[PDB]
Structure 1
């Protein structure tokens, strides 16, 4: 597999390392999303320590109002992160 192809599976891998931990196995609730960010995006994103900060990140990502981040909402999150990296973090 190519680097692109490996990167694609890595995106799917990380979603499920976190999504299956609690409740709905196919969505990241706030507590799972916090965990993912703090453990998998520690170099790209400031550590989330306040519940308020998890809420605001989840409000941004949650396009269907169920209070959770599903896979396509996660893909939009990845697009935000990648775009920011691409821009050398503003």
Structure 2
């Protein structure tokens, strides 16, 4: 598999590594999202320590108002993070 194919698989893997811990196994609730950010984005994002901070990230990500981040919404999060990295974390 190419690096791109392995990358695609990695996105799926990390989603399900966190989404399946609690409740809906196919969605990240705020507690799961907090863990993913703190454990898997510790180099790209500042650690979330306050509930207000994860509430704010979930508000941004949750496009269908169910209070959780589904796979499609996670892809949008990945695009946000990748765009930030691409622009050398300038904004």
The bucket for the TM-score relative to the shorter chain is over 0.9
Query: How many angstroms does 1:17 deviate by?
Result: 0.3
What is the number of equivalent residue pairs in this alignment?
Answer: 90
Secondary structure of the structure 2 residue equivalent to 1:8: helix
Q: Which residue of 2 aligns with 1:14?
A: 14
Unaligned stretches of 5+ in structure 1? none
CA distance in 2, matches of 1:89, 1:80: 11
Query: Structure 1 stretches (4+) deviating beyond 2 angstroms?
Result: none
Partner of 1:57: 57
Aligned to 1:35: 35
Q: What do residues 31-66 of structure 1 show as CA deviations (whole Å, max 9, x unaligned)?
A: 000000000000000000000000000000000000
Deviation at 1:3, TM superposition (A): 0.1
Distance 1:61 1:80 in 2: 10
TM-score by length of 1: 1.00
- SS of match in other structure, 2:28: coil
Note the C-alpha offset of 1:86. 0.1
